[PDB]
């Protein structure tokens, strides 16, 4: 679940 954070961070 920590990967999903930066996944849409710049989004």
Coordinates of C-alpha atoms in Angstrom, one line a residue:
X1 CA 0.0 0.0 0.0
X2 CA 3.0 2.3 0.2
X3 CA 3.5 2.1 -3.5
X4 CA 0.0 3.3 -4.3
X5 CA 0.9 6.6 -2.4
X6 CA 3.6 7.9 -4.9
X7 CA 1.6 6.3 -7.7
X8 CA -0.9 9.2 -7.7
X9 CA 1.4 11.6 -5.7
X10 CA 2.1 14.0 -8.7
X11 CA -1.5 13.3 -9.9

